[PDB]
């Protein structure tokens, strides 16, 4: 594989997935083990704790990128507030592409779960969102979506051109153009059989964003109705 130098630098920012998976699994096990039989976290409550912990990993990933670090905290907050849910969904989708089997759901804790089991515990909204995500998983697997392209899409999601009120919007513009050019060069060069792959990759970002917008609004209102157990970071991202 011929990898643009920029993409190699982007990959250095990826967390140690095996270690992240273990740490979140121990946290969720200590959570259930620290309460009795009557107050055990519901499946929904566990997913909230899971997403909450994933958000910590996302924040630490962003702050590990040099480009992100050149921005002041106000700018960093504005970028992360605009895309945290999209990053969560994109991460979940990629996880199904890699460690995924059709009919199953692979979680950030490394647990493999049957799709129909989880789906039957969700309402109409999350069922529709989960099913739409699975359709994206299938489309991306057929395109041979790989880790190099994944990291590129993550940076394109983080450094969005639609975030307003930034001090250093120029840095955000420059990152978007650089990653776009690197991703195009990488995809066209490593997947010549899948022509228009690059265009099909970018066409999926608006779908992933739409899914994550609905998911965020659902959680926000579930929290207002008191259905969301306390998850500091997740709650705080919603209450903004």
């Amino acid at each position: 594989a011929s990898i643009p130098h920029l993409i190699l630098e982007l990959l250095k920012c990826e967390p140690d997935e095996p270690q992240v998976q273990a740490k979140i699994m121990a946290y969720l096990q200590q959570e259930q083990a620290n309460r009795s039989k009557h107050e055990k976290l519901s499946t929904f409550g566990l997913m909230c704790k899971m997403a909450d912990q994933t958000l910590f990993s996302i924040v630490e990933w962003a702050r590990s990128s040099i480009f992100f670090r050149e921005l002041k905290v106000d700018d960093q907050m504005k970028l992360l507030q605009n895309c945290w849910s999209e990053l969560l969904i994109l991460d979940h989708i990629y996880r199904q592409v890699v460690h995924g089997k059709e009919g199953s759901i692979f979680l950030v804790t490394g647990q493999q779960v049957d799709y129909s089991i989880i789906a039957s515990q969700a309402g109409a909204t999350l069922n529709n969102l989960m099913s739409h995500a699975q359709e994206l998983v299938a489309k991306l697997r057929s395109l041979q979506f790989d880790q190099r392209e994944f990291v590129c899409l993550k940076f394109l999601v983080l450094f969005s051109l639609d975030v307003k009120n930034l001090e250093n919007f120029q840095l955000v513009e420059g990152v978007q153009e650089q990653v776009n050019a690197a991703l195009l060069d990488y995809t066209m060069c490593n997947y010549p059989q899948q022509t228009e792959k690059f265009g099909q990759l970018l066409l999926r970002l608006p779908e992933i964003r739409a899914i994550s917008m609905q998911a965020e609004e659902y959680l926000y209102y579930k929290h207002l109705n008191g259905d969301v157990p306390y998850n500091n970071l997740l709650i705080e991202m919603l209450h903004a």
């Binding site: 924040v59 630490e60 960093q76 907050m77 992360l80 500091n232 970071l233 705080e236 903004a240």
Partner: peptide, 10 residues
Amino acid sequence: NALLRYLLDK
């Protein structure tokens, strides 16, 4: 947004 600000400063 206090906790996110702390995470990015820590």
